[PDB]
């Protein structure tokens, strides 16, 4: 049948963890989760973001395990956290995104396209300001916009980009 | 279940 | 007080490596 102390303890710990998620127990989650370590980890990812004490690391580790082999559930999440967190150097993230897409050919490509768009917006206002210059940044911004346009292709979004270019 | 109950009891005792 | 995820990461790495 059920284990003497060990099986019952695990079940009770899981129940307690569920109760902690229902009611935030930053402390309960920290000790309950530790006891629970003895797939899955969304609650662990959730507790770090819900109760902080910088919640980005655990998700990265989870995403890293079980790679070799719709799409992957661990991952499509990790990517979203990144852009929102950014909202350190981003280029790097964009590079990582490309790498993932290369390895695996909801499409990640859409997420990658969205990420560049954020950079363009920052570029658009910085360029608009006088402190007064004619080429450089404007040409760079135009190139970025074209690149963003290509990825989406292969209405609201397009409209937004256009507005952005005009302001710049 | 019995084991769990026992554990709970023990915990309670400890608390007391 | 609490080891944190750090502990989980270390465990995983060791398992990659032989653990006993």
């Amino acid at each position: 049948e059920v284990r003497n102390y060990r099986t019952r303890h695990i079940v009770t710990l899981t129940d307690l963890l569920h109760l902690n998620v229902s009611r935030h127990n930053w402390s309960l989650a920290y000790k309950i989760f530790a006891t629970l370590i003895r797939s899955l980890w969304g609650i662990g990812v959730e507790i770090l973001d819900n109760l902080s004490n910088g919640l980005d690391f655990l998700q990265w580790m989870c995403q890293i395990y079980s790679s070799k082999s719709h799409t992957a559930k661990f991952a499509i999440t990790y990517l979203w956290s990144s852009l929102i967190n950014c909202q350190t150097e981003n280029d790097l993230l964009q590079e990582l995104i490309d790498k993932i897409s290369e390895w695996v050919l909801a499409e990640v490509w859409f997420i990658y396209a969205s990420c560049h768009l954020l950079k363009a917006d920052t570029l658009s206002r910085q360029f608009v300001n006088d402190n007064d210059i004619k080429i450089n940044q404007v040409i760079k911004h135009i190139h970025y916009v074209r690149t963003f346009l290509k990825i989406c292709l292969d209405r609201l979004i397009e409209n937004q980009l256009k507005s952005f270019e005009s302001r710049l | 279940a019995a084991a769990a109950a026992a554990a709970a009891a023990a915990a309670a005792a400890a608390a007391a | 007080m609490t080891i944190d995820q750090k502990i989980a990461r270390r465990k995983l790495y060791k398992i990659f490596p032989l653990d006993r």
Binding site: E102, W103, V104, L105 | - | -
Partner: protein
């Protein structure tokens, strides 16, 4: 598992990069086509190039 160029030199092994080759299988005038991403084997990658990490 990112691997630097330098490890290969010490190891005396080819700094081979992994290739990705996906096919297009069309039968009966391409009524149905299945594409499979498959390993294309390993080929050497030039240092300080786009494929390389440096």
């Amino acid at each position: 598992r990112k691997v630097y160029p330098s490890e290969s030199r010490q190891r005396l092994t080819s700094y081979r990069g992994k290739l990705l080759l996906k096919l297009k299988w069309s039968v009966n005038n391409g009524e149905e086509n299945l594409f499979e991403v498959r390993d294309c084997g390993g080929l050497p990658v030039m240092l300080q190039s786009n494929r390389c990490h440096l």
